[PDB]
Amino acid sequence: AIMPPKTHIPTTAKYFPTIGDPYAPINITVFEEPSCSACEEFSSEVFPLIKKHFVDTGEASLTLVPVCFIRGSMPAAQALLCVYHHDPKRPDPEAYMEYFHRILTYKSHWATPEVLAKLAEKIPTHREINPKGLIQCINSQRFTEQLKKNNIYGSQIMGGQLATPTAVVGDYLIEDPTFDEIERVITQLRHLQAI
């Protein structure tokens, strides 16, 4: 009830939209924009492989951070965080990511609640996601200030390289990442760990 203020921006993966083991030695942190054209191939062909090869093995933690840089994306950005927080008790990144993926693979005035609500249907949650609640949360623009933290966070992280998709493996920064690039960097990280 009465506690100190929350951090402006968290210090551990546990408190970011993350799947896998939060204590894991390696952390993959990905930044994506709801409208980025280069992210469609990534979330569809690259992101799952990251999950399968490094996250499902307990080798890495996978964080996905949303950002809003081009007009028409804020509604979708709102919906993402609206779904991420569909349950007051527990944030479920699993629903939030699958929702994201569905948005990235969707074909400038595109982001409408109806389209955002339809994509949100049948979404797997740990006690279900309602359209009317989702539409209300989008119009409310609850998470405008949050997305500003994300933009500034991802910016300061990339030294201004505000382009997506951008994945961060350990302390390494890979623009327009591929699976080979990500794997090649992990091979180095496993090697340094071995040292």
Author numbering: 3 to 109, 114 to 132, 135 to 203
What does the paper behind this entry write?
Disulfide bond proteins (DSB) are thiol-disulfide oxidoreductases found in the periplasm of Gram negative bacteria which catalyse the oxidative folding of disulfide bond containing substrate proteins. Here we investigated the DsbA enzyme from Chlamydia trachomatis, responsible for human urogenital chlamydia infections. In the present study we confirm that CtDsbA has oxidizing enzymatic activity and a structure similar to that of other DsbA-II type proteins that contain a second non-catalytic disulfide bond. We find that CtDsbA has a particularly weak oxidizing potential for a DsbA enzyme, which appears to stem in part from its uncommon active site dipeptide motif of two uncharged amino acids.
We solved the crystal structure of CtDsbA, which was determined to 2.7 Å resolution by using molecular replacement methods. Consistent with all structurally characterized DsbA proteins, CtDsbA comprises a thioredoxin domain into which a second helical domain is inserted. In CtDsbA, the active site motif is Cys-Ser-Ala-Cys. CtDsbA’s dipeptide sequence is notable in that it lacks a Pro at X1 and has a non-polar aliphatic residue (Ala) at X2. In the crystal structure Cys38 and Cys41 are oxidized, with a disulfide bond length of 2.03 Å. Notably CtDsbA has a second disulfide bridge formed between Cys 84 (H2) and Cys 145 (H5) stapling this helical bundle. Notably L1 contains an unpaired cysteine residue, which to our knowledge is the first structural report of an unpaired cysteine in a surface loop adjacent to the active site in DsbA. In CtDsbA, Cys 70 is positioned at the C-terminus of the B3 strand, and directed towards Ser 75 and Met 76 of the adjacent H2; as the side chain of Cys 70 is relatively buried in comparison to Cys 38 it is unlikely to play a role in interaction with substrate or redox partner proteins unless this loop undergoes a significant conformational change during the catalytic cycle. CtDsbA is strikingly charged near its active site with a pronounced patch of negative potential in this region.
